[PDB]
Design a protein around this ligand. Structure first.
Ligand SMILES: [K+]
Ligand SMILES: [K+]
Ligand SMILES: [K+]
Ligand SMILES: [K+]
Ligand SMILES: [K+]
Lengths: 322, 322, 322, 322
């Protein structure tokens, strides 16, 4: 069976045979947004520069763009469309070098400077706001949360437990962090219904609230494999044959970014290590604890790990008493 | 009985016989906001343009707007109110073509350029901020979350279950997604109290946390109809007669928009299909799983579905043993 | 005993014998912020206008502010401090009428235009950002959520229940809404410890998740008074004598404002009505349900309501069987 | 054993042997950001000022920068690189004194004013947005939430309870506040696995939802030490010998800042006071309750507090009955 979720967290699914303006600004690439706005300015500057040029022609300002004791142009020094364009830039950008300067003569020209300024003012606001939308809502978010490459199975305090490690790469904390885990596989119900990919919970302590982690130094996430586990009947010899996936999730409000995140990784049946345990990454030093993230993913063998399933172990203790 | 909630999610209720400035900017329509600001500019530009015109009259600048070796206007080239208005625009917009230029002579005129600039500066800030308020808080949000048209009833693993499908239209994930469901109907209590529309929970697994979904490919939301269900006594023959509504809800933090959402749909008793199951939309391909959203809403008959209620089925197994 | 919480939601507590720059901008009043910034501009404009004036003196520009074939001022037309000030405004506001125009002569003056522009640019950014801080984080939030004036006690489906109504004033929904309730009173422990105001939970269905409301039309919030209630032994005759408070809370993410809210109200023992029920505000109309918020707070007598406590009622049924 | 968490809340851990642009702007210090932008302006202003200077040379504007009846410079009064630089500032800042004014002659110069304006416009937006990023996401957040210096152990209503006080310093409320507590210590499993710092929950009422606090006046956080506690076997005589840490956490959405917070403090075994209770900080006044935060941290002896562990107390009542 192919993967649903990849190690990085990416979901491996394609939609087929299937928008708000705000959200689309956050989607469109940077260079396409910066293009898109540059277009919005020209579209305005030309439009207006043209309006100002039309006005400059009808009033006869192209023949006498300076004016004199009698004649007075609507806008001074608009001798052609280039100057009409330059004025329109200078008015909306509000550079306004002033060589081309609007005069009192033409009420339309006055109205048109007014309109352009508001238009120009509205355009800028949208651009500023469009950008912090894109900055504050980045589709590339660095992977502050690290997952181990492998989950493992081992004995903790007399119970068989699937385990995987989660670790924070930034010193910035994660507020209200809580883990989940799911077994992903296709199954057919007792009434012969095919479920393409049935998602089945792997309990990590939601009922007592132990799924709530305080992640400072990398924590190992336990899952007791017992009656109510879906790995209950699965032994090490089954693990090689069996073909399932285990999605591990860590949701949390990350104070670095100030927005909630959903960390993701996957462990296929063939990525899980029976009879293994992780290398301690937290070490005592007189002054200060230190995490060494080089040993993060590393494990070691535990030969004294039962090769049979959790059920088998349960079934043995009942029979030895008889 | 008329509907409370529509298929789109809209609530069908009217308030009768019943504000912050920030929230009202998010309500007022765009064209009314853009009008509203355009007004705010004129109100200022005229106001100031008038103040500058009054000053230009009293100081005698309308008779000699250029000045000479002796006489020096407060602001140059303010020959009328048009030029006084143009100066006020040019000062607050900060275009400042400079033909109309404030001079050193009048301390009031100097103060008035100062005031206007700050006023103009404050106005712009409010406009920029008013707009990203409106962008970041849109009252039209695209329906990223899709609900099936029909819920259905069928047998899963030996239990009678009401089911409805939920699906994500964007590839963007939904963080901390969790489902609810409610049966909406008027009822009268045993002490003769009329409840216009009593909202009654339809359990989808809140107690063990199975109401938490990891929605990548469209999930079917189960509700086991058992002792504690309100559909417990309801059989297929009752379904045609009975008149109730079932609101289905999916709340979740949508990372596309970065704000929490409440997806809504409704299933009236006459919209629920007894003896049906949904068409698989997830299909195996060697490279990559694919969801086909054309089969999203579609179902098929299951004649082997018990036409009696969940209670009836329970009552049968007790009697066959005797 | 005096009140902890008022009807509006305000908390009645004073701190005695007890900051970030961002949060303090959200606290300081508007007129003090707008003052504060106006000061920030003058402080800069004067400062710079002075620097430019000093430069204009040392270079000898006050005697020949125009210049000629030989002499060329650092900045033209800075004949006094007024013009030096006007230039500094015109440079930082970037009006720049241009009558006072920086020239090539003085590298210091050139540096000083550069510095001022960046300073001016940084100042504006802070002002824009300071304002949307204040807009987006308003300390006055309209009371979209309405609480009834009175809680009541009555029989629902064979159990004695304290009840209070909550209602949404805007059509805008409240996402992930959930209720709480607390009994507030001073008490002394069995080991003689005085607790000034012991906060004690009044259960409204947190354990099964019924505390989660879908508030469209005003809901009545039930509290079953049973063994585990603190109103268990309290009868109607005790209610007049007893002196306690009941804080009712509704937290929820309000999509109108897009920020979480904590609605608050209080019911003192003397504000609770034994033997009463609320007036139906939802009415059936052929087209569309309608809530009438004029009957929101109103109740009616129920004489058939047991005047004894919930415990008494429990104690009666045990004794009638014997 | 050294500390994991300090009294202030700081975590005492170092990462060794181990980014998005948005988040890095929130990290970089202010003076380095303000430097960084000042650089961004010069880099542009020089770049463009150079481009304009190159153009001014090739067209021959340095020999005749004014122009005449025949010759007309691309940009007027660009006599050197200083004026070419001044023009580039005046164009991008949009001061545009206008002495140096772009003319119609050179289409390249016209294009270059256009490019610069958009570039300048894009730069400003990024700066404004970069700043409110830094303001809205401060790494220094004032400690609105106060923790007691010491936890204590004492008897409440017939049970041995570890207790610590939490208090709100601002009058601004904390929405959806909920407490946690953890015992931090290294331990070795029954299968000989060393856990550097095993985090173990100290129950404060998550299962019934009593971990949800409504913090107005400073609350004391109880932890019943019973069978399921990790302080169950620990007596006062053990407390001096034992070496463990107790991290206390309060997460909550703080309406002052409008962002979720994670308050932290620690109590080492040697910081906990057996046989003590806190000083009442809430006092009755006719008008208004008052909290006095001077008595916040203070306690008093309770000699009638059992010096033995909670288990011992349990073991005594079983034996006295026999
Ligand atoms: K300008
Ligand atoms: K200008
Ligand atoms: K100008
Ligand atoms: K000029
Ligand atoms: K100018």
């Amino acid at each position: 069976r192919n993967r649903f979720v990849k190690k990085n967290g990416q979901c491996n699914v394609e939609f087929t045979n299937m928008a708000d303006m705000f959200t689309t600004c956050v989607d469109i690439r940077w260079r396409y947004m910066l293009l898109l706005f540059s277009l919005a300015f020209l579209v305005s500057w030309l439009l207006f520069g043209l309006i100002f040029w039309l006005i400059a022609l009808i009033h006869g300002d192209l023949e006498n763009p300076g004016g004199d004791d009698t004649f007075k142009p609507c806008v001074l020094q608009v001798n052609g469309f280039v100057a009409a364009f330059l004025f329109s830039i200078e008015t909306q950008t509000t550079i306004g070098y002033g060589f081309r300067c609007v005069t009192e003569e033409c009420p339309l020209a006055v109205f048109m400077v007014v309109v352009q300024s508001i238009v120009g003012c509205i355009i800028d606001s949208f651009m500023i706001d469009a950008i912090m939308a894109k900055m504050a809502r980045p589709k590339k978010r660095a992977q502050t949360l690290l997952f181990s490459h492998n989950a493992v199975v081992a004995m903790r305090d007399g119970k068989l437990c699937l385990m995987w490690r989660v670790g924070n790469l930034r010193k910035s904390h994660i507020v209200e962090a809580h883990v989940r885990a799911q077994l992903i596989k296709p199954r057919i119900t007792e009434e012969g219904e095919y479920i393409p990919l049935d998602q089945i919970d792997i309990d990590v302590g939601f009922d007592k609230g132990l799924d709530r982690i305080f992640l400072v130094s990398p924590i190992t996430i336990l899952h007791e494999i017992n009656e109510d586990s879906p790995l209950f009947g699965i032994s090490r010899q089954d693990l090689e044959t069996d073909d399932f996936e285990i999605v591990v999730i860590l949701e949390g409000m990350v104070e670095a970014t100030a927005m909630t995140t959903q960390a993701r990784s996957s462990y296929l049946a063939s990525e899980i290590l029976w009879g293994h345990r992780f290398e301690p990454v937290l070490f005592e030093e007189k002054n200060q604890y230190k995490v060494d993230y080089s040993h993060f993913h590393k494990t070691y063998e535990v030969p004294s790990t039962p090769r049979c399933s959790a059920k088998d172990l349960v079934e043995n203790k009942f029979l030895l008493s008889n």
